[PDB]
Ligand binder design. Structure first.
Ligand SMILES: Nc1nc2c(ncn2[C@@H]2O[C@H](COP(=O)(O)OP(=O)(O)OP(=O)(O)O)[C@@H](O)[C@H]2O)c(=O)[nH]1
Ligand SMILES: Nc1nc2c(ncn2[C@@H]2O[C@H](COP(=O)(O)OP(=O)(O)O)[C@@H](O)[C@H]2O)c(=O)[nH]1
Ligand SMILES: COc1ccc([C@H]2[C@@H](C)C(=O)N2c2cc(OC)c(OC)c(OC)c2)cc1O
Ligand SMILES: [Ca+2]
Ligand SMILES: [Ca+2]
Ligand SMILES: [Mg+2]
Ligand SMILES: [Mg+2]
Lengths: 422, 53, 319, 439
């Protein structure tokens, strides 16, 4: 029954994970009680990808909530859909991780990982056919980043032939907690290159800009940013959650979106960001405008290796293809020619809450290298003076592991550059 | 243009009209290959586990 | 904004059409191998017609007709005329022809061998010297028409455009390519009347400019000197010959119900004898033009062969 | 009488299978419960339809078929659809997880572990056959199951039934319907592995069927159901001579004999006409001449290609409906003089014609109108090689950069099977080059 196990870790990871569940629970007609009151069965046909059934026939998210301190999870619990989650599925320590990758990966997080793997095992073992795992986290803190990557390693060890998928929030000076964010992210990306099959790169720089230069929010809160993230995450998982002419699953996705095993970092796109529904031509233009991208790279600086796009709502499948095909055949400079038919299009009838038309885009572009450069430059600006490193050497790390993580990110960048020029 | 080999029956008929004349791998080999590919997988998995260790 | 690619980099006429297409601001060029194109300007050899018309949402178009080499290789031309019912064996405007291998016809070639001077290319009076060139054999036309003063031979090149609908367009302007050198009889200069043994050995463009005489000029000459016109003495036969050849191959090359569409530019080459009879030399599938024409014509192409299919934001006679 | 066994593999194979069997049941007058009123020999027989149906003492008629998919969801719709009573549960075989559009995963990894069970369930069907001719295998080129599992099964059927004939109906990949970017890979791979194991393969380019559904049924966005119903009309025409009284193409050996002089060049082009919309209010019923003539339009071919620019090796006309030989020869007469129809030097310019007086059956509420006469032409032209050249080129585009190859290697395959497959197809392109063209 192609079940997915969802894991959310750290402050960011749990905040956006929680919103995610709010949104999709509403789309599937589940209320804060886990009770179904929807009007279709398109809501229920694949409900088991994300939800386990209850004794009274209630639906309970296949979700595991993880943190090294309890604050955020207390908030999640006391939030709107807080009580939907399995309470055994809250796994947390007391001490925190101090925005320190080393504490999440090596010291504090090591002490909690096994209890997390216990809840994971308990959720996997009752899966008819488990697809893989979905992790929500940021890369700039300590828990979601250090402990999140540690977790991905353990899961890969225990389930080496399942798919690992992340939604990974990338740090930016614009919207920043601490200065060590580049260190934590460079260390984390290195893990993600070896141990995931698909990673959605969600850049906080982009979310800030869309919030500021577009949504016209002058002082954008984390709730504002998370609302974009929530919409993107719902769009990006539509084809898994709903029945269509496609059977979408994680493995087929990875096979069709990843031509080289290391280049599996995707730029998501969304449209629109209202009483006038958009027309298919507007969806198409907006989706592919840099301004609707959530990774803060401009797609005209690179080339698309692959693209997956869904349109949500009742519209003209013919007009979609016409428009899709049109934007390709207007912009062939920005798609690779050596991968025939590298743009794929689908349609769902059910739109999301509050829109009668929407469109979501998953792009594997070489322009994502811009993001990794941005991080590399920042990492190097400190590391060349070994600034701030004592926080990590004090947990047992050596400079060597840093130099290697740096190196592997720059190699990743070189790889993206090689294919942008082929 | 000649008709030839005409055959009739209750369901229909058949014929041939001319316009101009003219001037294995064994089970064992399969098993071999299907197992030399299990080995490559096993090997890859063993490398993975070594690295994880 | 329409799209196109270019797969013959060094094609004089099409180079000019590419250039002319961008000047409209409505056409973008792509790289040789980008299949998402509206229009190919393909290669001369092994053009992959097999890969055209399988791109969703694209009307596609190419500047060649698959199977047109039937008319453009002399072996095939001869075979096509001797063999095609609509052409008969000797249709009267094609030189007596035989095709011999390095068909072949050697035997039947000799039965009608009892003026017995020939030409075998792809000139002799005695069979041996040519036959020992180890192609096609024709009856060399001994008594041609000469321009005066100069006793100068010449051939005529006419340009034909055929569109995707199979309309046949003859370019208003033709060209005379003269061997502006006096004409002997069996000395090997004037015999090969063209820029193919004169651009090396052969005093270049004497009696007339670059050996090239045009239509107004030649019509006046035909009037003054022969009391006739170009239309009457020569063009009717030419128009008839073009129609007969292209209409012969029509059902084998036509793209009326194909998944891609074609057009192509041909260059027909003729000789007029002294009785004012027109003869077909050969048909060229990728012709060059003539310096002062590569403009009116090149634009004519865009107008009728291209923007007919891809509308934007007469120099031809229909046949 | 001599039995034939049908094997459906993957989503395409299975769904097309559903379409065909439904059709067969409507044509032979068999009901969803497997009852056939007109079969007066209760519980046995050896009429022509018994080639595709066996019987049970309680008068149920049962498809000589096996459905196989690596995931269960498509075959479940069969397990509980309109025709649930037709099949023995054990004829429907499903795995846990599918091949994820990976030939290697369908062939090596997952195939290895379902193949003996499949061959076994097939043996149980062969054992009920007094003189089995062989097999009809339906699958896509592009799926992981349809390519990888099929080539594995075809490798084993050659070993376990070395004397039987094997025929394919294969779905060739088209972008306007496709599901994966690696379909070219899977296509080449499965073609290479399956080539020496099959005797006659009918390719159906989805592009061509989609275009036909658009242009003639005036359907904006054709579904699988539309495509499949049309493909089933064609398959029915082709298989009609095994299930009905007749004298042309009466056994699978005869397909090979009549359509395939060279063993490698065993892909005959199918052309079909007419295709008419059921919501066409006013329709002028077409004539023998008109429909036979339509057999030389590309727009009606199962694979778009241009036969004017190739040579024929065989030509078979199969009419269904109000047709007599006289009108057939008249139409051939007129056509021979308007069209360019070149045969190769070492074969006769001619036609093997076959007629069945029962006109085409259509699904009620379908999208195809009923017609009084119809034809399917099976020719062997070198022009179909165009379709290899397309496929190969796509392969070459991706394989030069090695894109996606790691998914295959990761399953146990070596990069060498790619260059081997491709070399085999280069050889095949060359063969067609000889037979059809002059140096
Ligand atoms: N004509 C037609 N084509 C189909 C149908 N189903 C799938 N296809 C085509 O088949 C190719 C995909 O192959 P599938 O049959 O779906 O794959 P599979 O054999 O189930 O293998 P998996 O990868 O394991 O699912 C694509 O080109 C589809 O367009 C169908 O019902 N009719
Ligand atoms: N978009 C988004 N980013 C966040 C949120 N919370 C924290 N961040 C970012 O995440 C990084 C800090 O990581 P955080 O999750 O707070 O630390 P953790 O508890 O150790 O995992 C910084 O880059 C913050 O900008 C959130 O709710 N939404
Ligand atoms: C060529 O690129 C493709 C990219 C994606 C897919 C399908 C199939 C792998 C699947 O699952 N895809 C998918 C998944 C999607 O989400 C899981 C999705 O949008 C949300 C989508 O939009 C077209 C496609 C098929 C393709 O051929
Ligand atoms: Ca501690
Ligand atoms: Ca019976
Ligand atoms: Mg924080
Ligand atoms: Mg010449």
């Amino acid at each position: 029954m192609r079940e997915i196990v969802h894991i959310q870790a750290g402050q960011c990871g749990n905040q956006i994970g929680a919103k995610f569940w709010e949104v999709i629970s509403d789309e599937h007609g589940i209320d804060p009680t886990g009770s179904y009151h929807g009007d279709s069965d398109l809501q229920l046909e694949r409900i088991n990808v994300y939800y386990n059934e209850a004794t009274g026939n209630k639906y309970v998210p296949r979700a595991i909530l993880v943190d090294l301190e309890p604050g955020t999870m207390d908030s999640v619990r006391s939030g709107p859909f807080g009580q939907i989650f399995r309470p055994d599925n809250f796994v947390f320590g007391q001490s925190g991780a101090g925005n320190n990758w080393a504490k999440g990966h090596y010291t504090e997080g090591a002490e909690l990982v096994d209890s997390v793997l216990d809840v994971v095992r308990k959720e996997s073992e009752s899966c008819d056919c488990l697809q893989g795992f979905q992790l929500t986290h940021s890369l700039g803190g300590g828990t979601g980043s250090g402990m999140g990557t540690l977790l991905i390693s353990k899961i890969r060890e225990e389930y080496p032939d399942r798919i690992m998928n992340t939604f990974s929030v990338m740090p930016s000076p614009k919207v920043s907690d601490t200065v060590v964010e580049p260190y934590n992210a460079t260390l984390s990306v290195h893990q993600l290159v070896e141990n995931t099959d698909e990673t959605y790169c969600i850049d906080n720089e982009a979310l800030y800009d869309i919030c500021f230069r577009t949504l016209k929010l002058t002082t954008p809160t984390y709730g504002d940013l998370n609302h974009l993230v929530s919409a993107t995450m719902s769009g990006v998982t539509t084809c898994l959650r709903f029945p269509g002419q496609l059977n979408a699953d994680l493995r087929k996705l990875a096979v069709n979106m990843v031509p080289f095993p290391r280049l599996h970092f995707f730029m998501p796109g969304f449209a629109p960001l209202q009483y006038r529904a958009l027309t298919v031509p507007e969806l198409t233009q907006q989706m592919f405008d840099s301004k609707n991208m959530m990774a803060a790279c401009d797609p005209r600086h690179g080339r698309y290796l692959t693209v997956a796009a869904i349109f949500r709502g009742r519209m003209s499948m013919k007009e979609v293809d016409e428009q899709m095909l049109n934007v390709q055949n207007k912009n062939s400079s920005y798609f690779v020619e050596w991968i025939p038919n590298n743009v794929k299009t689908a349609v769902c009838d059910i739109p999301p809450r509050g829109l009668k038309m929407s469109a979501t885009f998953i792009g594997n572009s070489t322009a994502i290298q811009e993001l990794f450069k941005r991080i590399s430059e920042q990492f190097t600006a400190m590391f060349r003076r070994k600034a701030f490193l004592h926080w990590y050497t004090g947990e047992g790390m050596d400079e060597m592991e840093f130099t290697e993580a740096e190196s592997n990110m720059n190699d990743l960048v070189s790889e993206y550059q090689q294919y942008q020029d082929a | 243009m000649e008709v030839i080999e005409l055959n009739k029956c209750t369901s229909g008929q058949s014929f041939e009209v001319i316009l101009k004349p003219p001037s294995d791998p064994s089970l064992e080999e399969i098993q071999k290959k299907l197992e030399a590919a299990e080995e490559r997988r096993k090997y890859q998995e063993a490398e993975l586990l070594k690295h994880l260790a | 904004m329409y799209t196109f690619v270019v797969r013959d980099e060094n094609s004089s006429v099409y180079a000019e059409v590419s250039r002319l297409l961008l000047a409209t601001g409505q056409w973008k060029r792509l790289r040789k191998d980008n299949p998402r194109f509206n229009l190919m300007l393909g290669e001369r050899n092994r053009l992959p017609f097999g890969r055209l018309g399988h791109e969703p949402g694209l009307v596609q178009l190419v500047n060649y007709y698959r199977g047109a080499d039937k008319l453009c290789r002399k072996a095939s031309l001869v075979k096509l005329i001797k063999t095609s019912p609509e052409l008969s064996e000797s249709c009267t405007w094609f030189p007596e022809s035989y095709v011999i291998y390095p068909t072949d016809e050697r035997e039947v070639f000799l039965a009608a061998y009892n003026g017995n001077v020939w030409i075998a290319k792809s000139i002799s009076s005695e069979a041996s010297e040519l036959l020992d060139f180890i192609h096609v054999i024709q009856k060399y036309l001994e008594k041609p028409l000469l321009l005066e003063p100069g006793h100068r031979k010449f051939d005529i090149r006419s340009w034909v455009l055929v569109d995707h609908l199979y309309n046949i367009y003859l370019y208003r302007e033709g060209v005379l390519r003269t061997s502006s050198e006096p004409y002997n009889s069996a000395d090997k200069t004037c015999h090969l009347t063209n820029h193919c043994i004169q651009k090396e050995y052969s005093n270049y463009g004497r009696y007339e400019e670059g050996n090239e005489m045009f239509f107004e000029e030649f019509n006046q000459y035909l009037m003054d000197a022969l009391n006739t016109t170009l239309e009457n003495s020569i063009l009717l036969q030419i128009k008839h010959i073009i129609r007969s050849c292209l209409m012969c191959i029509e059902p084998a090359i036509s793209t009326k119900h194909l998944h891609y569409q074609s057009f192509q530019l041909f260059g027909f080459d003729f000789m007029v004898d002294e009785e004012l009879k027109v003869w077909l030399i050969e048909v060229n599938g990728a012709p060059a033009c003539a310096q002062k024409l590569y403009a009116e014509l090149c634009q004519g192409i865009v107008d009728v062969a291209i923007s007919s299919v891809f509308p934007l934001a007469s120099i031809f006679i229909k046949l | 009488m001599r039995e034939c066994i049908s094997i459906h593999v993957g989503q395409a194979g299975v769904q097309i299978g559903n379409a065909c069997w439904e059709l067969y049941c409507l044509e032979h007058g068999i009901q969803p419960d497997g009852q056939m009123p007109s079969d007066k020999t209760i519980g046995g027989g050896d009429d022509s339809f018994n080639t595709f149906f066996s019987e049970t003492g309680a008068g149920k008629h049962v498809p000589r078929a096996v459905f196989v998919d690596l995931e269960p969801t498509v075959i479940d719709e069969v397990r509980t659809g309109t025709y649930r009573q037709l099949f023995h549960p054990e004829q429907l075989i499903t795995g846990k997880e599918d091949a994820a559009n990976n030939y290697a995963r369908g062939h090596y990894t997952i195939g290895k572990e379902i193949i003996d069970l499949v061959l076994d369930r097939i043996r149980k069907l062969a054992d009920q056959c007094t003189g089995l001719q062989g097999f009809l295998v339906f699958h896509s080129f592009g799926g992981g199951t349809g390519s990888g599992f099929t080539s594995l099964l075809m490798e084993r059927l050659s070993v376990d039934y070395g004397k039987k004939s094997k025929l394919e109906f294969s779905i060739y990949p088209a972008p306007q319907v496709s599901t994966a970017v690696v379909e070219p890979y899977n296509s080449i791979l499965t073609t290479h592995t399956t080539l020496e194991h099959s005797d006659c393969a009918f390719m159906v380019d989805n592009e061509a069927i989609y275009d036909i559904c658009r242009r003639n049924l005036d359907i904006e966005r054709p579904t699988y159901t539309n495509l499949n119903r049309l493909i089933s009309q064609i398959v029915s025409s082709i298989t009609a001579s095994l299930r009905f009284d007749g004298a042309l193409n009466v056994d699978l050996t005869e397909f090979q004999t009549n359509l395939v002089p060279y063993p490698r060049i065993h892909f005959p082009l199918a052309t079909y006409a007419p295709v008419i919309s059921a919501e066409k209010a006013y329709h002028e019923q077409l004539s023998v001449a008109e429909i036979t003539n339509a057999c030389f339009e590309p727009a009606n071919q199962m694979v778009k290609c241009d036969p004017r620019h190739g040579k024929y090796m065989a030509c078979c006309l199969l009419y269904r409906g109000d047709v007599v030989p006289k009108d057939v020869n008249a139409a051939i007469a007129t056509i021979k003089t308007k069209r360019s129809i070149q045969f190769v030097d070492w074969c006769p310019t001619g036609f093997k014609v076959g007629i069945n007086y029962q006109p085409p059956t259509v699904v009620p509420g379908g999208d195809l109108a009923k017609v009084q006469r119809a034809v399917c032409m099976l020719s062997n032209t070198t022009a179909i090689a165009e379709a290899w050249a397309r496929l190969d080129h796509k392969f070459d585009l991706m394989y030069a950069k090695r894109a996606f190859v790691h998914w295959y290697v990761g399953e146990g395959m070596e990069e060498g099977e790619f260059s081997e497959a491709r070399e085999d197809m280069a050889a095949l392109e060359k063969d067609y080059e000889e037979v059809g063209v002059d140096s």
